[PDB]
Ligand binder design. Structure first.
Ligand SMILES: [Mg+2]
Ligand SMILES: [Mg+2]
Ligand SMILES: [Mg+2]
Ligand SMILES: [Mg+2]
Ligand SMILES: [Mg+2]
Ligand SMILES: [Mg+2]
Ligand SMILES: [Mg+2]
Ligand SMILES: [Mg+2]
Ligand SMILES: [Mg+2]
Ligand SMILES: [Mg+2]
Ligand SMILES: [Mg+2]
Ligand SMILES: [Mg+2]
Ligand SMILES: [Mg+2]
Ligand SMILES: [Mg+2]
Ligand SMILES: [Mg+2]
Ligand SMILES: [Mg+2]
Ligand SMILES: [Mg+2]
Ligand SMILES: [Mg+2]
Ligand SMILES: [Mg+2]
Ligand SMILES: [Mg+2]
Ligand SMILES: [Mg+2]
Lengths: 117, 67, 70, 153
RNA sequence: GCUUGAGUCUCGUAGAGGGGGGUAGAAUUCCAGGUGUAGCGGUGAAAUGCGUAGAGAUCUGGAGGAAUACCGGUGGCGAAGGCGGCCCCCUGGACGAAGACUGACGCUCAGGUGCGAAAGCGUGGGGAGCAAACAGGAUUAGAUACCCUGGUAGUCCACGCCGUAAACGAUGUCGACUUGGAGGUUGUGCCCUUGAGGCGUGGCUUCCGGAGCUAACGCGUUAAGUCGACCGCCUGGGGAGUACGGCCGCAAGGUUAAAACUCAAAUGAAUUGACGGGGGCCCGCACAAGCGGUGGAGCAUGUGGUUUAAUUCGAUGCAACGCGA
RNA sequence: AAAGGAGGUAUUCAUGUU
């Protein structure tokens, strides 16, 4: 309701699923949308088009707040990773910043064991 | 090629010299590979040590991240 | 890989620039290799052998560059 | 094939209207090599459609065919071990043939008594955008929309 | 007696060599809180699991443990195992220059002594992540597995024990000699460094290759080449690194180490094929794009089977079944 | 991430600006 006209798009793009969350510059979340809620399941929910439609659904969700400016923080190795950006641009926000915030450890915790498939 | 340090006969890389260190770190804050920069291996090790010291002294940033 | 949209810069151009920056940083490669822990032996093997394979091809080119193709 | 790009064959234009499109339509309609009956049926249907729809037989036929032409089809690629049902844009030459084939099959199915009457009704339905042929095309487009996720494969 | 082997001293060099003690940031986890709402997670596809007591996501703060991205290199160091953020303290070895010094002080080594990855054991701590066992969900004909969600010992620390590895260069230590080339790394001398250069001289290190050697594969001045010193080991395959005994060990077990019996091979390298759920290249109605069929019905015909006194015999993946006929 | 094409065995290649 409280128009701020500038948001931050946290695009958490894992291999399985993509979550897009629009938040205020300070950190309070406004609206979010995911491929799971977009209806795609499994091999279809792990696709870039699903990411784009989730981005559009989120854009509609946060339309009430009337945000115009938009900085983007993309995180994680996700299949789309970009279709979300294109979807936001199409939705019609001025993309201000494109930032990668993928958390890379400096040789920290040991990852899980390698899959034998 | 053209190892810059041996051109001037530099004896030791100084971590206080920020400008050169900034020229030898990438935009993300990672150390530039010696094959790319063309430095000799000995000076490469010296430069790496100096950059790490500068990182500790907060003259150079660790990573192009939140901080 | 921080990118801020330049003044009067098209969005597609900025997006291509950002992808270029990500590539140069090598972020996807880093996360992709870091997903699963390889054993130290596996790393040492799978790297030294690949390096020697590269050297062999370098030798092959430098030698076979002195023969009659036809 | 593997190693063969043979040149296209010589096709005669239609005697009445000089249309290559109509010639291929007659050939598609024809069964068991009975070209005479096929051409009579085509001509009868075209005349009836002309009188009903508009001014010219060729004009009405072209209008219907365009209203049935498909923009996109789907094929089955097999790259990642599994087969992906992917949309793909269909080339201009294949568009006309696919439309004509769909129209002919729909005409065959329909319950009108004469073949010429069936063809005329189907062509008129295509012109009106309510026909079985356009329904089939629209379902193909619907499937293409469903599988649009693979549009860069 | 001598100074060439060996060792000492003077000055420097590089180093993830070792022990101890601090510290840094990223990241994971958890806790507290704010925003915010119905999915999250996971797979080839799912479910178990988690979420309306509000998850996942996002911001702030806090706690804790472990490990040190980039640099990073067929790079370095160490007798071997092995060693990787930065800083300090203690400490070992190697190499170069020029000299000076001692004067064979050397090499090897059975027993013996020490060091010795990982797993394991004892005592006491610590415990983020990971993860044998175990639990559950799948898969499957079965699945005591591979896949998924959890998850204890352990992985970490201190002090002890164990003492084995494909502990591998599958190459015992030391010394001498014998054509070359391209590199890397670390010293150092000279030439105008004619600026990043040119010519030497050491140490360590990778590849290619000559003679020579080798069963061949290949090794090839870092020899598996020609020789010299000492030591360890082998004597067909299984039985068997097993039994017994001895020694060591808290235990697990380790070390030393047979015999009966049984077979006539077991093996090494290389060659020609065939095959591969190896790689690349190419073709055929092989697929794909189409058209028309068969498999449903009735009838013709052949085969199987069954029946019969006989239902004459043969053909029976493709390549027999309107076949000999 | 895959495919096609080119260069290199890849680097000094004025800075500036960016
Ligand atoms: Mg996983
Ligand atoms: Mg251990
Ligand atoms: Mg213990
Ligand atoms: Mg305990
Ligand atoms: Mg598991
Ligand atoms: Mg042994
Ligand atoms: Mg080895
Ligand atoms: Mg041995
Ligand atoms: Mg050789
Ligand atoms: Mg024993
Ligand atoms: Mg044993
Ligand atoms: Mg015993
Ligand atoms: Mg043919
Ligand atoms: Mg076919
Ligand atoms: Mg039947
Ligand atoms: Mg039949
Ligand atoms: Mg009859
Ligand atoms: Mg006979
Ligand atoms: Mg018979
Ligand atoms: Mg017979
Ligand atoms: Mg026949």
């Amino acid at each position: 309701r409280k128009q701020v006209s500038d948001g931050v798009a946290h695009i958490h793009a894992s291999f399985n699923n993509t979550i897009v969350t629009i938040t205020d510059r300070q950190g309070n979340a406004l609206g979010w949308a995911t491929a799971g809620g977009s209806g795609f399941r499994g091999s279809r929910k792990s696709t870039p088009f699903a990411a784009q439609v989730a981005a559009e659904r989120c854009a509609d969700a946060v339309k009430e707040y009337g945000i115009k400016n938009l900085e983007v923080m993309v995180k994680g190795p996700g299949p789309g990773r970009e279709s979300t950006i294109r979807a936001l641009n199409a939705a019609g926000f001025r993309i201000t910043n494109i930032t990668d915030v993928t958390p890379i450890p400096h040789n920290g915790c040991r990852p899980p064991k390698k899959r034998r498939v | 090629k053209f190892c810059r340090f041996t051109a001037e006969g530099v004896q030791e890389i100084d971590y206080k010299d920020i400008a050169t260190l900034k020229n030898y770190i990438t935009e993300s804050g990672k150390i530039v590979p010696s094959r790319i920069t063309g430095t000799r291996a000995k000076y490469q090790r010296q430069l790496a040590r100096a950059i790490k010291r500068a990182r500790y002294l907060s003259l150079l940033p660790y990573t192009d991240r939140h901080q | 890989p921080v990118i801020k949209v330049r003044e009067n810069e098209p969005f597609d151009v900025a997006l291509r620039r950002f992808k270029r920056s990500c590539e140069k940083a090598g972020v996807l490669a880093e996360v992709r290799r870091r997903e699963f822990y390889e054993k130290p032996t596996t790393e040492r093997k799978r790297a030294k052998a690949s390096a020697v394979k590269r050297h062999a091809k370098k030798l092959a080119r430098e030698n076979a560059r002195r023969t009659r193709l036809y | 094939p593997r190693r063969r790009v043979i040149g296209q064959r010589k096709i005669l234009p239609d005697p009445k209207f000089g249309s290559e499109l109509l010639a291929k339509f007659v050939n598609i309609l024809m069964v068991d090599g009975k070209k005479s009956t096929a051409e009579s049926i085509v001509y009868s249907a075209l005349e009836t459609l002309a009188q009903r729809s508009g001014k010219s037989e060729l004009e009405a036929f072209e209008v219907a065919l365009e209203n049935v032409r498909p923009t996109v089809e789907v094929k089955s690629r097999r790259v990642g071990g599994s087969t992906y049902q992917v949309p793909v844009e269909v080339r201009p030459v294949r568009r006309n043939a696919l439309a004509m084939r769909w129209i002919v099959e729909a005409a065959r199915k329909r319950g009108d008594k004469s073949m010429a009457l069936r063809l005329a009704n189907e062509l008129s339905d295509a012109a009106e955008n309510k026909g079985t042929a356009v329904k089939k095309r629209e379902d193909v487009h619907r499937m293409a929309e469903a599988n649009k996720a693979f549009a860069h494969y």
